[PDB]
Write an enzyme that holds these catalytic residues in place. Sequence first.
Site, PDB file in Angstrom:
ATOM      1  N   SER C  14       0.769  -1.223   0.000  1.00  0.00           N
ATOM      2  CA  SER C  14       0.000   0.000   0.000  1.00  0.00           C
ATOM      3  C   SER C  14       0.810   1.289   0.000  1.00  0.00           C
ATOM      4  O   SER C  14       2.010   1.289   0.244  1.00  0.00           O
ATOM      5  CB  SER C  14      -0.815  -0.005   1.338  1.00  0.00           C
ATOM      6  OG  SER C  14      -1.716   1.102   1.302  1.00  0.00           O
ATOM      7  N   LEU C  16       3.036   4.570   0.032  1.00  0.00           N
ATOM      8  CA  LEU C  16       4.367   4.885  -0.449  1.00  0.00           C
ATOM      9  C   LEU C  16       5.202   3.673  -0.878  1.00  0.00           C
ATOM     10  O   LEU C  16       5.908   3.764  -1.890  1.00  0.00           O
ATOM     11  CB  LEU C  16       5.164   5.661   0.628  1.00  0.00           C
ATOM     12  CG  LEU C  16       4.490   6.927   1.180  1.00  0.00           C
ATOM     13  CD1 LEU C  16       5.388   7.623   2.178  1.00  0.00           C
ATOM     14  CD2 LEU C  16       4.084   7.897   0.042  1.00  0.00           C
ATOM     15  N   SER C 149       9.785  10.993   9.142  1.00  0.00           N
ATOM     16  CA  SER C 149       8.646  11.923   9.018  1.00  0.00           C
ATOM     17  C   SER C 149       9.063  13.346   9.395  1.00  0.00           C
ATOM     18  O   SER C 149       9.979  13.469  10.223  1.00  0.00           O
ATOM     19  CB  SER C 149       7.530  11.531  10.004  1.00  0.00           C
ATOM     20  OG  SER C 149       6.519  12.552  10.063  1.00  0.00           O
ATOM     21  N   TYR C 162       4.603   8.501  17.958  1.00  0.00           N
ATOM     22  CA  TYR C 162       5.031   8.557  16.562  1.00  0.00           C
ATOM     23  C   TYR C 162       6.309   9.357  16.369  1.00  0.00           C
ATOM     24  O   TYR C 162       7.240   8.878  15.715  1.00  0.00           O
ATOM     25  CB  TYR C 162       3.892   9.128  15.692  1.00  0.00           C
ATOM     26  CG  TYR C 162       4.088   9.075  14.194  1.00  0.00           C
ATOM     27  CD1 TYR C 162       3.905   7.891  13.489  1.00  0.00           C
ATOM     28  CD2 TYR C 162       4.373  10.229  13.455  1.00  0.00           C
ATOM     29  CE1 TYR C 162       3.973   7.855  12.107  1.00  0.00           C
ATOM     30  CE2 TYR C 162       4.491  10.181  12.069  1.00  0.00           C
ATOM     31  CZ  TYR C 162       4.295   9.003  11.399  1.00  0.00           C
ATOM     32  OH  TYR C 162       4.433   8.925  10.011  1.00  0.00           O
ATOM     33  N   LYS C 166      10.035   8.096  15.013  1.00  0.00           N
ATOM     34  CA  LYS C 166      10.639   8.682  13.817  1.00  0.00           C
ATOM     35  C   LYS C 166      11.928   9.456  14.135  1.00  0.00           C
ATOM     36  O   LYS C 166      12.871   9.450  13.321  1.00  0.00           O
ATOM     37  CB  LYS C 166       9.631   9.563  13.033  1.00  0.00           C
ATOM     38  CG  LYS C 166       8.369   8.834  12.518  1.00  0.00           C
ATOM     39  CD  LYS C 166       8.689   7.535  11.745  1.00  0.00           C
ATOM     40  CE  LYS C 166       7.503   7.077  10.900  1.00  0.00           C
ATOM     41  NZ  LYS C 166       7.834   6.070   9.847  1.00  0.00           N
ATOM     42  N   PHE C 195       1.071  13.243   2.799  1.00  0.00           N
ATOM     43  CA  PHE C 195       0.821  12.573   1.544  1.00  0.00           C
ATOM     44  C   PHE C 195      -0.557  11.891   1.451  1.00  0.00           C
ATOM     45  O   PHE C 195      -1.114  11.334   2.401  1.00  0.00           O
ATOM     46  CB  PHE C 195       1.899  11.505   1.261  1.00  0.00           C
ATOM     47  CG  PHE C 195       3.164  12.039   0.629  1.00  0.00           C
ATOM     48  CD1 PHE C 195       4.042  12.834   1.352  1.00  0.00           C
ATOM     49  CD2 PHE C 195       3.489  11.738  -0.676  1.00  0.00           C
ATOM     50  CE1 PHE C 195       5.189  13.352   0.767  1.00  0.00           C
ATOM     51  CE2 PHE C 195       4.620  12.245  -1.288  1.00  0.00           C
ATOM     52  CZ  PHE C 195       5.487  13.059  -0.557  1.00  0.00           C
TER      53      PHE C 195
HETATM   54  N1  LIG Z   1       1.152   9.211   4.146  1.00  0.00           N
HETATM   55  C1  LIG Z   1       1.762  10.170   4.867  1.00  0.00           C
HETATM   56  O1  LIG Z   1       1.300  11.302   5.005  1.00  0.00           O
HETATM   57  C2  LIG Z   1       3.112   9.828   5.558  1.00  0.00           C
HETATM   58  C3  LIG Z   1       3.746  11.023   5.992  1.00  0.00           C
HETATM   59  C4  LIG Z   1       4.978  10.794   6.627  1.00  0.00           C
HETATM   60  C5  LIG Z   1       5.585   9.580   6.843  1.00  0.00           C
HETATM   61  N2  LIG Z   1       4.842   8.466   6.392  1.00  0.00           N
HETATM   62  C6  LIG Z   1       5.416   7.133   6.602  1.00  0.00           C
HETATM   63  O2  LIG Z   1       5.356   6.457   5.373  1.00  0.00           O
HETATM   64  C7  LIG Z   1       5.408   5.008   5.611  1.00  0.00           C
HETATM   65  C8  LIG Z   1       4.355   4.428   4.681  1.00  0.00           C
HETATM   66  O3  LIG Z   1       3.092   4.971   5.134  1.00  0.00           O
HETATM   67  P1  LIG Z   1       1.829   5.023   4.151  1.00  0.00           P
HETATM   68  O4  LIG Z   1       1.216   6.354   4.120  1.00  0.00           O
HETATM   69  O5  LIG Z   1       2.178   4.459   2.822  1.00  0.00           O
HETATM   70  O6  LIG Z   1       0.815   4.057   4.928  1.00  0.00           O
HETATM   71  P2  LIG Z   1      -0.029   2.774   4.476  1.00  0.00           P
HETATM   72  O7  LIG Z   1      -0.929   2.406   5.590  1.00  0.00           O
HETATM   73  O8  LIG Z   1      -0.782   3.034   3.227  1.00  0.00           O
HETATM   74  O9  LIG Z   1       1.071   1.673   4.206  1.00  0.00           O
HETATM   75  C9  LIG Z   1       1.955   1.119   5.232  1.00  0.00           C
HETATM   76  C10 LIG Z   1       2.078  -0.389   4.977  1.00  0.00           C
HETATM   77  O10 LIG Z   1       2.906  -0.955   6.048  1.00  0.00           O
HETATM   78  C11 LIG Z   1       2.331  -2.211   6.418  1.00  0.00           C
HETATM   79  N3  LIG Z   1       2.696  -2.583   7.792  1.00  0.00           N
HETATM   80  C12 LIG Z   1       2.181  -2.077   8.970  1.00  0.00           C
HETATM   81  N4  LIG Z   1       2.648  -2.703  10.046  1.00  0.00           N
HETATM   82  C13 LIG Z   1       3.504  -3.667   9.548  1.00  0.00           C
HETATM   83  C14 LIG Z   1       4.294  -4.659  10.174  1.00  0.00           C
HETATM   84  N5  LIG Z   1       4.427  -4.856  11.494  1.00  0.00           N
HETATM   85  N6  LIG Z   1       4.968  -5.510   9.346  1.00  0.00           N
HETATM   86  C15 LIG Z   1       4.908  -5.320   7.994  1.00  0.00           C
HETATM   87  N7  LIG Z   1       4.202  -4.441   7.332  1.00  0.00           N
HETATM   88  C16 LIG Z   1       3.498  -3.643   8.163  1.00  0.00           C
HETATM   89  C17 LIG Z   1       0.813  -2.041   6.229  1.00  0.00           C
HETATM   90  O11 LIG Z   1       0.141  -3.302   6.051  1.00  0.00           O
HETATM   91  C18 LIG Z   1       0.726  -1.131   5.003  1.00  0.00           C
HETATM   92  O12 LIG Z   1       0.578  -1.907   3.815  1.00  0.00           O
HETATM   93  C19 LIG Z   1       5.157   4.843   7.116  1.00  0.00           C
HETATM   94  O13 LIG Z   1       6.395   4.603   7.763  1.00  0.00           O
HETATM   95  C20 LIG Z   1       4.612   6.222   7.536  1.00  0.00           C
HETATM   96  O14 LIG Z   1       4.919   6.521   8.905  1.00  0.00           O
HETATM   97  C21 LIG Z   1       3.638   8.565   5.752  1.00  0.00           C
END
Ligand SMILES: NC(=O)c1ccc[n+]([C@@H]2O[C@H](COP(=O)([O-])OP(=O)(O)OC[C@H]3O[C@@H](n4cnc5c(N)ncnc54)[C@H](O)[C@@H]3O)[C@@H](O)[C@H]2O)c1
EC number: 1.1.1.35
Lengths: 241, 241, 241, 241
Positions: C14, C16, C149, C162, C166, C195
């Site tokens: 999913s 990123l 982050s 969180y 990070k 994002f």
């Molecule tokens: N979307 C944003 O605004 C944003 C901003 C800053 C940082 N981030 C970071 O980006 C990264 C990706 O986030 P995203 O927005 O794509 O979220 P998302 O929920 O769409 O995807 C994260 C994926 O990680 C998987 N995951 C969760 N726990 C897990 C575990 N224990 N083992 C294996 N897989 C696991 C989930 O099943 C999911 O598919 C994260 O580290 C998040 O903190 C996201």
Amino acid sequence: SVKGLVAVITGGASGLGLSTAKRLVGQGATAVLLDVPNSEGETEAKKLGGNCIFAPANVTSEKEVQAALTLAKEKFGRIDVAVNCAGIAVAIKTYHEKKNQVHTLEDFQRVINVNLIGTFNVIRLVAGVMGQNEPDQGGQRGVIINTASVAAFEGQVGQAAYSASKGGIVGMTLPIARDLAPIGIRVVTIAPGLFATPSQVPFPSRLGDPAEYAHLVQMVIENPFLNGEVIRLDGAIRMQP
Amino acid sequence: SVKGLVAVITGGASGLGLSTAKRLVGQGATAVLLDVPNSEGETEAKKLGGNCIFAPANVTSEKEVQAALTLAKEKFGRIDVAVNCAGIAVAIKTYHEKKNQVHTLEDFQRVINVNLIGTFNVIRLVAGVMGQNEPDQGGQRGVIINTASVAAFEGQVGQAAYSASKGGIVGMTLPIARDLAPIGIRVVTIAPGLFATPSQVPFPSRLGDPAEYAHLVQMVIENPFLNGEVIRLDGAIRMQP
Amino acid sequence: SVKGLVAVITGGASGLGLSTAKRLVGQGATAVLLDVPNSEGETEAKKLGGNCIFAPANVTSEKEVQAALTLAKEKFGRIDVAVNCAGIAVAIKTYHEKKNQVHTLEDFQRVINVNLIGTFNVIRLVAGVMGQNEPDQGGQRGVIINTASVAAFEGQVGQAAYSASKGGIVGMTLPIARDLAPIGIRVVTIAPGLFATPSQVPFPSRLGDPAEYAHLVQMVIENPFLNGEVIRLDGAIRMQP
Amino acid sequence: SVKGLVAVITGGASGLGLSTAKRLVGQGATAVLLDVPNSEGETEAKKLGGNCIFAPANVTSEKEVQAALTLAKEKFGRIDVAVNCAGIAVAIKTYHEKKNQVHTLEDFQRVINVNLIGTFNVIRLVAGVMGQNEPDQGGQRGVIINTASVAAFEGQVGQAAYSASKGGIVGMTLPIARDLAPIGIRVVTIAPGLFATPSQVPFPSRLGDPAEYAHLVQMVIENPFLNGEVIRLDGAIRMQP
Ligand SMILES: NC(=O)c1ccc[n+]([C@@H]2O[C@H](COP(=O)([O-])OP(=O)(O)OC[C@H]3O[C@@H](n4cnc5c(N)ncnc54)[C@H](O)[C@@H]3O)[C@@H](O)[C@H]2O)c1
Ligand SMILES: NC(=O)c1ccc[n+]([C@@H]2O[C@H](COP(=O)([O-])OP(=O)(O)OC[C@H]3O[C@@H](n4cnc5c(N)ncnc54)[C@H](O)[C@@H]3O)[C@@H](O)[C@H]2O)c1
Ligand SMILES: NC(=O)c1ccc[n+]([C@@H]2O[C@H](COP(=O)([O-])OP(=O)(O)OC[C@H]3O[C@@H](n4cnc5c(N)ncnc54)[C@H](O)[C@@H]3O)[C@@H](O)[C@H]2O)c1
Ligand SMILES: NC(=O)c1ccc[n+]([C@@H]2O[C@H](COP(=O)([O-])OP(=O)(O)OC[C@H]3O[C@@H](n4cnc5c(N)ncnc54)[C@H](O)[C@@H]3O)[C@@H](O)[C@H]2O)c1
């Protein structure tokens, strides 16, 4: 204790520099206020007593700064501490679409000249004077304290010149402390948030009081291991555009 | 002045926490040393007199920390200040070619658990106790001080677990100060360079003295506008690999 | 060019991590999606073709991560790039007024375990596999990219867990690059702002598109001199409480 | 893709600026080299062909910079990208005890004038020209990339003037991006470590190659969400005194 130390404070006729002079003189130190001739320097130094004098000088002038330092060393015998608070500000965008106006080169240069070149001018001349002191028991001969701003890290719309000048003070803090290490002169910078001088803050939710800046300068003077670092004094605010 | 304030100091049986307790009790405050049962907490608290007691507790345990805070309140009436100095360290590479050895997951976990999770455990429970105090004239109910390290910024070879733990303390300093702004509790972090506790430093050229860390804690407790910031206390050193 | 390189992407089912896999496979690379069994991993890997496979694994488990890396090396012959995107989030204050509720220790522990301990667990195990590769013409054997982050620098109200997780990723970026320098593995960290994944941004004034994170990951893989650094990808936003 | 874009590159006759022009023209862009009359600009522009011209100008002069930007707009139709690489350096201590030598005010002023005032002069005048462009599909009208240095963060002995100039570039990066947000102009800064232009580094263990700085410039031009940020390009080095 700051008892008996001799300090030169630029921008000492008003706001942060004046409040710093009131605290140090009240704890037994001697203070020299360095500020421009048309300021209130002379009457603030008279109100503060015989251990506070006024020395008129523009920080961009090599000759006027040198004469003010010579006066201090003759009146009081040596210089132990220097605090840079002299500074100015403007609020002008890089480019303003609605008025179709471009920031002038002269307004940028002026802010750089007083804030950044003026603070280095005081540092370079005061270092040779502190170098004449006999080292204390821990090898120290002096302490230099500078004033930057949180705008070196989160500059707002209209602050490009001011931010550039204060980011320049932050950037030279470490190399100047490394240069002066062999003669025992510490170099530290303070970065204030918003102060009440001539509700965005988390806590306390108000403008800073100048006496809180003065208390932090005294702490920096007393602690022997603080050096080459920048400290934010701002109630936990982070500036928005 | 810290006269009459009540402070709980984790890791107070030794090094930085012990030196902090000596200074604050000598200025008229009351101190509770929170450290493990096998430490020398009890005899250090006896040497300092009737305004310093020992409370045995492991910072990773919810039950033991709660019982130590209940004891402090029962004995002294309230809690004004908390200082987190409890901490451990290891020196293990992420992967060591020479012996074909990967860092174990268990050694990383242990360092995170004591240093980072134990510091948040003390913060969350002490905040509810400080929240019971009537606000002073400036709206303040308490002050929390944490100990990170310059390794949060220049971690060396072998410091991955320790740097992760101290980088986590730095990262949570602002969100915790923003969370506790409405009830008047300030949150500030100190980051020490190398100290003489159980040639590379620019000036002074020696290990830090624990009494210099204690002086910085006292000034953080006294200045009402310092909040949500991290302060380096290191003689201007920058760590090499 | 990333053509022919082999990449393992955690959190690849999913947001990123998925968008990263789509770009790299589109440019000729092979990708392994590491994500939990209950995710959509298997059908995304099938939609992307024969150069993309799914390997179910929880990043906090040593055994399941080891088995996923063995599968990748078995199927594709080697591992050249690892991208950590697996992560979770919570919004809980350290101490909450209206409900009189303290942050639980268990909620803080769980966020630290998945985000910070799970990223170190993938790093430690993949470094030994990359170490098996023969060095390219510039001495390089692999590249590891982590996801932090902007909350590591401006954590908001309710983000203490969180932000701590990070900030620990940021803190260990340099010591881990220094540890792996002798075998030619670069380590870089990306810090996203907001994002669009499952009006406050200066410009462009919108949420980030996951395809923009994927382009920055490819740039990091291609540039040989980028190492031990953290890069903000956020439209120039700075987060308020 | 940078195909078709028009770039103005200051300090384009040598080192980082020249390598940047080579890469961009190689990818189908047009380039204008802005450098002093005594440089080799004319013959480098001729070697690159008809999509690369030379425009003699000193960045501290607003008349010469304005005439160069007018020449670019008339020759190529518009200006899409601006890269500031023009810069100088000195190695002089703030004070030297043995020889009793004080850093001159004039040498500090010179370095600030070329490096910091010259970069703001190019930014202020090119912004109005970019403002004339029709916004693309995402609202963008231009991109401005500046060159700072790792000396803005770890300045060495002898670098006080250079560090002050580069710390000023870092500090004005965010306010200038916030100012230009309403018209769609992104502002990003690169901080190089040690590069082979007219032992130490963790990995790769060597001076950086100018072609690696040019690759990072291209990625900054192509990524639409990178804005108001500073990026280190240095092989993970951290500078000692
Ligand atoms: N979307 C944003 O605004 C944003 C901003 C800053 C940082 N981030 C970071 O980006 C990264 C990706 O986030 P995203 O927005 O794509 O979220 P998302 O929920 O769409 O995807 C994260 C994926 O990680 C998987 N995951 C969760 N726990 C897990 C575990 N224990 N083992 C294996 N897989 C696991 C989930 O099943 C999911 O598919 C994260 O580290 C998040 O903190 C996201
Ligand atoms: N008040 C705030 O919110 C605040 C916030 C951040 C930073 N600062 C900084 O703190 C310092 C002190 O400012 P302040 O608020 O007390 O302002 P102020 O105007 O009350 O005091 C500054 C003094 O500097 C003097 N000065 C100006 N140019 C000079 C020159 N060329 N030579 C000699 N003296 C000169 C002025 O005459 C004045 O007396 C400045 O560097 C300012 O940028 C203030
Ligand atoms: N001394 C240095 O050079 C230095 C440099 C940087 C940071 N620090 C940090 O300063 C803090 C104090 O360190 P120090 O030098 O005085 O070490 P120290 O060993 O003298 O004291 C640390 C104390 O913490 C206690 N402690 C350890 N684990 C505990 C637990 N689970 N529960 C309760 N108490 C526990 C110990 O028993 C000890 O009394 C630590 O966080 C350390 O990481 C020290
Ligand atoms: N080479 C490194 O190690 C390094 C490291 C960090 C930062 N930098 C920075 O990278 C940039 C490029 O430097 P470089 O290494 O390629 O040096 P360089 O000397 O090879 O090229 C810089 C060019 O700038 C031009 N220039 C100087 N003053 C000028 C003026 N007033 N007006 C117009 N042009 C002028 C020179 O004529 C020269 O062609 C500079 O800003 C420098 O500070 C370089």
